[PDB]
């Protein structure tokens, strides 16, 4: 069990209501393997600094998982294959 | 590699008296755990030459301790090999 | 027959030549008269005199299409980089903003071998 902080940049054509239950089917992959989820903060719309795949807006979501190494390497795999996800950035918060 | 709650089970099985971390039995039993763990990092990753050199420094330090325990008391050398392995 | 009041002048100034093209802000070329179009041939094209005639020839040929105000985007390590901008002011144009869009690689592709002259 290691801490992580996943930042996902979602496509801005999605609405701000279905942003939370769309990520639940990905964060249920963690809970089937023993890891748990702490803080699913959603920042909302924010202007990007450069254009990512013909989009100038993005939705910022911070995941803050705390799971095994093999499930987080599975979580960003399914996040990359989803079409509503532009970027994915997985970083550790421990030392 | 070899965290603090992982080297205690080696020192209980092989150490002499409940705090003995520096005896020839205690040091060899830790190095054999490090050598046998570093070889799985060298079955995957055949080209990690900067880590295979570290394996040769743990073999050469282990073989000097095996030579030391086979000089001062040959009875301790017999029971230490049979519990770990040689040749 | 194209008519546009606001434009964008691009200047490329190398060690051999200068080229002054004038576009609209959408990026479509109106007039482009360079230092070989104004009559020069060889090493004379790199002189600062050949840059203040290339900028005059592109300016009057752009004012016929209605260009009254440009933006300047110079690039290149040339010596005709400052005299071309002052040549646009003495042709009836307004310069507005002068930018710098010289390409700067982030140590990408390999440069050629250095000259042993």
């Amino acid at each position: 069990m290691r801490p992580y902080e996943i930042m996902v940049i979602l496509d801005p054509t999605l609405d701000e209501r279905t942003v939370a239950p769309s990520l639940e089917t990905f964060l249920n992959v963690v809970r089937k393997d023993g890891g748990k989820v702490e803080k699913v903060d959603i920042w909302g719309k924010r202007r990007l600094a450069y254009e990512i795949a013909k989009h100038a807006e993005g939705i910022y979501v911070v995941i803050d998982v705390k799971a095994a190494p093999a499930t987080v390497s599975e979580l960003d795999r399914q996040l990359s294959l989803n079409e509503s996800v532009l970027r994915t950035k997985v970083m550790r918060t421990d030392k | 590699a070899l965290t603090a709650e992982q080297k205690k089970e080696i020192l209980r099985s092989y150490g002499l008296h409940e705090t003995d971390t520096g005896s020839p039995e205690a040091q060899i039993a830790l190095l054999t755990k490090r050598i046998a763990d570093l070889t799985e990092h060298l079955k995957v990753h055949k080209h990690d030459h900067h880590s295979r050199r570290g394996l040769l420094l743990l073999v050469g330090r282990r073989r000097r301790l095996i030579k030391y325990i086979s000089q001062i008391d040959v009875e301790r050398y017999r029971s230490l090999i049979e519990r770990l392995g040689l040749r | 027959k194209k008519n546009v009041p606001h434009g964008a002048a691009h200047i490329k100034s190398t060690f051999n030549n200068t080229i002054v093209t004038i576009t609209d802000p959408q990026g479509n070329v109106i007039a482009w008269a360079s230092s070989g179009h104004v009559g020069f041939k060889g090493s004379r094209k790199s002189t600062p005199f050949a840059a203040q005639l290339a900028a005059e020839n592109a300016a009057r040929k752009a004012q016929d299409h209605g260009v009254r105000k440009v933006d300047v985007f110079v690039k290149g390590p040339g010596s005709g980089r400052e005299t071309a901008i002052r040549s646009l002011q003495a042709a009836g144009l307004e310069v507005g903003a002068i930018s710098d869009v010289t390409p700067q690689p982030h140590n990408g592709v390999r440069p050629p071998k250095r000259r042993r002259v």
């Binding site: 600094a49 450069y50 990512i52 | - | -």
Partner: protein, 64 residues
Amino acid sequence: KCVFCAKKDQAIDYKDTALLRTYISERGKIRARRVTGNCVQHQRDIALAVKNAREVALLPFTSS
């Protein structure tokens, strides 16, 4: 003279883009160590906070 060594417990994070509007130039380039007074350890922490903020589109690579 370093800010992060005097004022303690201020974590340099790549999320905190308000902290990273300074320590970059007007053209979006990382400032030198001898102009911000940082030490060696925190200049390395500023630079990984800036290089990571560029990959998540919180700071521009180049600007004008």
